[PDB]
């Protein structure tokens, strides 16, 4: 039975590959030959948000586009007022080892998680004027890689146990569990309509899930190494990825195959984070080599470099407004680039 | 009033400096080791689903934060990025054990990891009394698993602890030599392995860790001051 089932699975793999290849008439490079290249994109460090003790591992912009939460391995969440560099909050964490942080779209909560296998929800707007833990979402058997708020009550989280889970914060129990990734899930990205989310794992494959149904819609396997970053294209029909193999790949949900790969021969180090600009034309990627490269999404060539970090650029994020880009680094400073 | 907001930010920065002092004054240690190794007993004997079990203990008025990784997947590639820039790694091995080759491969992976390249390893060879009993009894011999012990002879520098048979000293020094060889193969001077012959009940473990942290911090400062 095992051999027969494997043969059937390989036949299905071949069918999927053939269909994807047939759908490949042109490539995004050919279509984007016409469009004039973005040219030289230059952005300067408008702010430096210092005050963290240890490596900054994650950051997330608030929907208001001014406040941004930031996590460091010293057990500190700091909500910065990006405009004035003010520390709005400094939430001490019960677990020093934090690998992810999220900001609720309403701005009322920040989620947090890491090597404690727990995603802690913090209530920013209590009546006591002190940020307190609103919930602790236990149930993962590995570290929390990424977490994102669907709303004030729903949060979906990756894990190093190779599963993604959707939670109901009031109840504190997993509404549904997404299984199928063969390696540690390293990042999420919620679609702008929040009906779909895509997760990259250490098995070098990116999967698309349906939150309401709870099942993998389709799978993408372009990369040769583990995926460290993933972000949805603003249109919601494509998403970029970042892998240790030092290349981004842009997939389209409807073509169900890679559209383009962003890589250069000198670029020989892994990617830690990726995101698009407001229009989706620029694909900002952070790298292990202490700097961040700006790519022309439609084309395949660098449009600039956000050099200026003294250590690994661990996290990167673009305001929902699209006005500025915040990049955190293992040297413990966030920098806002505009 | 944004002036009051700036005052609040000032207060937060004051608290952050207060905590920065504690963070600087404390040393962080990553505890590793296979389940058969008595790392759990090592943390238990410290007299001061979940993924980490922090242990606080203090020696000569210096605080040590020892982190033991708990519920985590069998592959340690990714989460060991966090423990980059810790004071040291305490890799514990069962000397008696035979999964000693698994321990050797694990130690090789830890040593040659990209991010742990500047992290010294306080290599613990635990359960040495059990190794002594194993060798003396003759039920099992390391020659069955490793062929070089049929050729190895005790080096001169091997100081015999009183009451130790020559056979057990030779065995334990062969075990030590395995790990020292793995460490010296890639040791470029950025990180140093610190082998130790230890037992589960030994209260000397905290003192040994403190001494090796003293040496590691001494090397770090020496490199910082351009003396190495």
């Amino acid at each position, epitope marked *: 039975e095992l051999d027969q089932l494997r043969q059937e699975a390989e036949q299905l793999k071949n069918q999927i590959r053939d269909a994807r290849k047939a759908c490949a008439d042109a490539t995004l490079s050919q279509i984007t030959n016409n469009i004039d290249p973005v040219g030289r994109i230059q952005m300067r460090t408008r702010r430096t948000l210092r005050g963290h003790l240890a490596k900054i591992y994650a950051m997330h912009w608030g929907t208001d586009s*001014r406040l941004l939460v930031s996590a460091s391995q010293d057990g500190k969440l700091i909500i910065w007022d990006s405009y004035t560099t003010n520390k*709005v909050h400094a939430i001490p964490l019960r677990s020093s080892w934090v690998m992810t942080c999220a900001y609720a779209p309403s701005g009322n909560y920040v989620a947090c998680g890491g090597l404690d296998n727990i995603c802690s929800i913090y209530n920013l707007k209590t009546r*006591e004027g002190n940020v307190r833990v609103s919930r602790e979402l236990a149930g993962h058997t590995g570290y929390l890689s990424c977490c994102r708020f669907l709303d004030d009550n729903q949060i979906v989280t990756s894990s190093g146990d190779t599963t993604c889970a959707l939670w109901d914060i009031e109840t504190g129990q997993q509404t549904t569990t997404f299984t199928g990734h063969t390696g540690d899930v390293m990042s999420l990205s919620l679609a702008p309509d929040t009906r779909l989310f895509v997760s990259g794992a250490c098995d070098a494959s990116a999967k698309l899930w349906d939150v309401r149904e709870g099942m993998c819609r389709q799978t993408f396997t372009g990369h040769e190494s583990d995926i460290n970053a993933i972000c949805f294209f603003p249109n919601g029909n494509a998403f970029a990825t970042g892998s240790d193999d030092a290349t981004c790949r842009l997939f389209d949900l409807r073509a169900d195959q890679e559209l383009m790969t962003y890589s250069h021969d000198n670029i020989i180090c892994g990617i830690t984070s990726v995101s698009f600009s407001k229009s989706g034309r620029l694909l900002l990627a952070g790298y292990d080599d202490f700097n961040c490269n700006v790519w022309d999404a439609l084309k395949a060539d660098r449009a600039g470099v956000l050099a200026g970090h003294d250590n690994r650029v661990s996290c990167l994020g673009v305001t929902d407004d699209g006005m500025a880009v915040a990049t955190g680094s293992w040297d413990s400073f966030l920098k806002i680039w505009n | 009033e944004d002036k009051a907001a700036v005052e609040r930010s000032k207060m937060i920065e004051k608290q952050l400096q207060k905590d920065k002092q504690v963070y600087r004054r404390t040393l962080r240690l990553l505890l590793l080791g296979a389940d058969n190794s008595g790392k759990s007993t090592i943390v238990k004997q410290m007299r001061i689903t979940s993924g980490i079990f922090e242990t606080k203990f203090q020696v000569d008025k210096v605080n040590f934060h020892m982190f033991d990784v708990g519920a985590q997947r069998d592959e340690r590639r990714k989460w060991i990025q966090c423990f980059n820039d810790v004071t040291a790694i305490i890799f514990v091995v069962d000397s008696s054990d035979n999964r000693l080759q698994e321990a050797l491969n694990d130690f090789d992976s830890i040593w040659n990891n990209r991010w742990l390249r500047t992290i010294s390893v306080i290599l613990f060879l635990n359960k040495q009394d059990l190794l002594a009993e194993k060798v003396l009894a003759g039920k099992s011999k390391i020659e069955d698993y490793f062929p070089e012990f049929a050729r190895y002879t005790t080096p001169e520098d091997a100081t015999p602890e009183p009451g130790e048979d020559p056979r057990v000293t030779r065995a334990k020094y062969f075990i030590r030599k395995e790990f020292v060889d793995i460490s010296t193969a890639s040791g470029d001077g950025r990180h140093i392995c610190y082998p130790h012959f230890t037992c589960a009940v030994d209260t000397e473990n905290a003192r040994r860790i403190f001494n090796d942290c003293k040496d590691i911090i001494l090397q770090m400062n020496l490199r910082e001051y351009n003396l190495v």
Partner: single-chain antibody
Amino acid sequence: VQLVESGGGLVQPGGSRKLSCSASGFAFSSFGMHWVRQAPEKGLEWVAYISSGSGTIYYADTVKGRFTISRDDPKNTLFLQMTSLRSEDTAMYYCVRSIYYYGSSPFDFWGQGTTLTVSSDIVMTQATSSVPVTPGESVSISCRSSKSLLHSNGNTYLYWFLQRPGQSPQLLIYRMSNLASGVPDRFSGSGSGTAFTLTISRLEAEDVGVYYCMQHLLTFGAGTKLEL
């Protein structure tokens, strides 16, 4: 969240007193406290302020030097010592809680207060002293300011307070547009940067009371009463 004032009573004009307010149910340290006096048959008047961490302190010109504000975090108590008094100082002394950071709501909670008795400014003017009205109707309570309350940063620092008879004031609208937590959507805030309007849409039996405007660019308005 509970702030109960202490002291109060009869004092001769040359005498001295000390009002104490004990905070309960919130992190008293993080909040900057105010003292606001409510003289009989007259509107609110801001007395003094002490920021978080016993830092910046301000007093009104009338009581600058005469009064002194003090704060004790361990006891969660706010003090207001008056070395000298007058007949004017007779007033219900409220202790007001406020916190300042981006998006916060200053002056959200008001203590019950104690009635002490005794033997340039941005003047706020309210268009009407009293507004006879019927239940279920909308009312456009309006006020003006000496200078535009719209700061360079981009928000008008205007606050609206409702004082139900026999109650302490309650924050309705802060920064001219944002409803306070627990305030029903009946109320609405609007303004031009120099003139402002609190346009309640449907009156309720609990919405009848005296409405005070305040600026925070501290001065309160004369107060507009609602008569059902």
